[model samples]
Target chain A: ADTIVAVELDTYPNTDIGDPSYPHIGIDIKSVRSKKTAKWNMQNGKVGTAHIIYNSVDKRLSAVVSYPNADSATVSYDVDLDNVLPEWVRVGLSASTGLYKETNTILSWSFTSKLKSNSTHETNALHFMFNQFSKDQKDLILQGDATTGTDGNLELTRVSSNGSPQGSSVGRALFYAPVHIWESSAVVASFEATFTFLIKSPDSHPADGIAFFISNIDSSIPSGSTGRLLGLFPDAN
Target chain B: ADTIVAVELDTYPNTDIGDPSYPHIGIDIKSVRSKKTAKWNMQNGKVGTAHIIYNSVDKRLSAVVSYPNADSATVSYDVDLDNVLPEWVRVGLSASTGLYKETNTILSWSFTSKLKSNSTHETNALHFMFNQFSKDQKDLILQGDATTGTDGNLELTRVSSNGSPQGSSVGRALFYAPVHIWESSAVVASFEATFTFLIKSPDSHPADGIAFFISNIDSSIPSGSTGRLLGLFPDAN
Candidate 1:
């Protein structure tokens, strides 16, 4: 039987820490192979296949946990667009951030229109871009607290202390808005889009952290925290 | 060799109907399959296709024709969706009128969108429809010019004629209003569209027919006619 509202999609595949309270029951979820592919699916067309993650890793860290004496659970998956829209994915990612941070991630599977161009930036074409940003919640953060830096390698930095720290005070909060999207094909010339997202703090972490994503073009992906380890960029955060 | 301009899209079973024009050359063209599989191709992460007719077939016909010569031509396809957001089609016809004519006609194609359902009327979904009407140029009179019984098989009239008949008393000849169309599909949910068509009368069987199409769908289908046939619709006059 097909489920309706139980499926939960997280844009940040890296942020799949299990939750015992409000466990995601009656839901079948998958990871996004990449960001671009996830945005393309949700904004248009009916969802096909089982729960699809934008980027599913062949060998990824998998775990499931719940609050003590709780009766709920959630599952996490992985995805990879490199195995999907590989040709166009080969065209390379353009950047305005000066970093390799992808702004417009799309999946190869979600591209159903006949407009088969490697790039979505052209006219009378099917192109899409991912944009996630928010000025209102720019200072919100989701963090994890730990006395021993046992949270997978030392991904830490002091933001402020006497106005002199390793990293500037963008605040300890994780922030990310919805990705802007655009598409075009013979039926239409383009797909333009924009949206927002909320951050999530894991069960044991409260300092500040983020998880990046490599989602597939399976559905409309949500935004998480933009900073930190990218765990904040998940759609469900 | 890479052909420039409107070269023939030879990626099909037929090449006879390929238009010898510029800007649209060497493009793949095909027709819409009736089953769940409508003809489509990939061109920029979007699906692209084409449809065609001979202007005499029967259905929706609207265009602006110029008699530069018997074989030369230039066209600007156009169409207008009353109280609806316009759709993007590879090529097709558009017209509307009350009473007197066939029921089903070809009109426009559109991408699927939720907002589209709320705004568009007859074509509320992501599809196309064609309308045909009667006035002057489209309605022919027997005028007793037949050697048969009281019913005349053919007579001639001007295009886009409104109520009443055509005569020297009115003097001015009415022509079919050029369809309003836009070749590109950019709007996700906007309630306006205009497409233009340019044509030439190579042969005059009475000479007033229009055909709209997308070159990427089907190359064999030619321009269709714009009026009615025995309680039925005919593309050619």
Candidate 2:
């Protein structure tokens, strides 16, 4: 089944006029295949009711916004992505206000996709990201200096490191995040991910590369590994 | 293979109605496992054609619209996920016409699940995330306010901040943009996105608690990092 990504941004406004100084909220929805991003912005103080909805069967994404004082509810953009990639959906939101302050809240957000299921209730999903990790459950195990942020940002290596024999270099980070996969299990989950990042060096040239490991070991890193090999193999002491 | 999301809002007139509006487009598409969401709308003006297409092998997304009287053939939402995640496929479309206006044109729409590929392609993958930095390419860097937007609103952070201690406040925004991924290097892209946001006060009482970002950085805050953390760490003078 296709996954549906839904979101809402709510802002309390002071006026009905569309002003650059008034409270504003922006929503961006994008399909991974095309990276075709559609953005919608609303001035809360100037509008009465504004809503966005995605219908799965019709495979349509539509937005409806109205200005009570202006007596107008314009259907800005009603998009149909029935022919676009329906498996992955990306959504984003932002808000701003001038002088006065108001509470801007995200009323609702959810990602709904069907999964393979057997007689057991367990899902066929192998791995899950973007969702928060539970307090009692350790979904991921980090090794070395590797860390995961409050958001879904995983830092394999730090930009700046403590001085070492390699001159603030020779850094390594490893992570072990397992998924559900079994022949007798209810379902066999698949894997997919999008990596967004930029890299810079203290000098013109940077050191080593980042290697991805998918081995049977749990939380394991090669010792004395750095430079060229990206700490994956024994390249430098 | 890439999934396609297609839709069309058609409007036509017929004698069955009061001669005002009759022919309309209805939405319907559901799997055997679940009852899907569907919607339909109609608007009649003149004769026009709308089309959507996605090629999974090369990994391309494109759409087209044509109106004879308008003298224009516009292409909307053509995205390439070659460098992003690519997987899954979903496709559909609907059209209708309104009263007195009945053109009802949905020229074509197609979804191809299998792509022309070689046998070397790997079809098994789990989860994938950031690992950009390497000897071949630079990893990541950040500019502008580390804090991002006002309250987490990057635009407001740009409009409202002048290097103040508070950086950018009274502004916040959030977004959830997803990408498509495939098992092998070949094209397999689909689109699915879900966005969620929340604003609360500081104590048990929250005050604007969400700010979303889609950039190339980790541990990097917009210049004005303040309450809600906006999903970034504090890094200022």
Highest lDDT model number: 2
In candidate 1, the second chain superimposes onto the true chain B with a TM-score of 0.17
Off by over 4 Å in 1: A1-122, A125-195, A199-237, B1-190, B205-208, B211-237
* Chain A TM-scores, candidates in order: 0.20, 0.34
- Steric clash count of candidate 1: 173
Worst 10 residues of 2 chain A by lDDT: A27-36
Chain A accuracy of model 1 expressed as TM-score: 0.20
What lDDT would candidate 1 get against the real structure?
0.20
Off by over 4 Å in 2: A1-123, A130-140, A147-154, A161-177, A182-188, A234-237, B1-237
Query: At residue A120, what lDDT does model 1 achieve?
Result: 40
As a TM-score, model 1 comes out at 0.22
**CA lDDT of each prediction against the hidden true structure:** 0.20, 0.26
Error of 1 at A235 (Å): 21
